[PDB]
Amino acid sequence: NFHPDSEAAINRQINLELYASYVYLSMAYYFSRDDVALNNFSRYFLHQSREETEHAEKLMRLQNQRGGRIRLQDIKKPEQDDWESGLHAMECALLLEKNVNQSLLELHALASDKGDPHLCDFLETYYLNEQVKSIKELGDHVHNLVKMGAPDAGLAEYLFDTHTLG
């Protein structure tokens, strides 16, 4: 029981998860630049990158298990190589995770229309809550950074780096 629009949509989500992994990887190595040097922001985003790779692998295994055929696409480069500040990176990540969430919600609605409860359950089990938690955590971080005066307050990002992300 597996539709072609479903196979295709899963393949599209695979690519999106790999893109998310790459964005986070880009931010991780931005924050270990010599003129940024926020080593816990770096570690934070590196860990998120690795999570996103696992998100992609889970969908690839789903595709294999349902007898679909994985069709990989180019992984697009992140839209910035200078992420400007710890606050700006967090805000960009929050938007990324909200766009990923809405793609997952779209995929869920497609699965519901197709009467594919196995795909709905897979998404609900592995993706939808983790996305909500991600979105909440990034939102938390953005709020704290703004309240502390980032990015122009000289100490906000340094102190956020050593305590919250430490």
Number of residues that bind Mg ion (CB under 5 A): 18
In the bound state with Fe ion, the residue whose beta carbon lies nearer, of 14 and 36, is 14
- Answer yes or no whether residue 141 interacts with Mg ion by CB under 5 A: yes
Q: Are 86 and 157 in contact (CB under 8 A)?
A: yes
Nearest to 86 by CA among 148, 9, 16: 148
Stretch that binds Mg ion, among 1-9, 60-68, 77-85, 151-159 (CB under 5 A): 77-85
In the bound state with Fe ion, the residue whose beta carbon lies nearer, of 115 and 166, is 166
145: Cα within 13 Å, side-chain hemisphere: 23
Q: What is the smallest separation between the CB atom of 84 and Mg ion, expressed in angstroms?
A: 15
Token couple for 13:
């989500």
SS3 label, residue 2: coil
Binding partner of 109, given Cl ion, Fe ion, Mg ion, none, CB within 5-8 angstroms per partner class: none
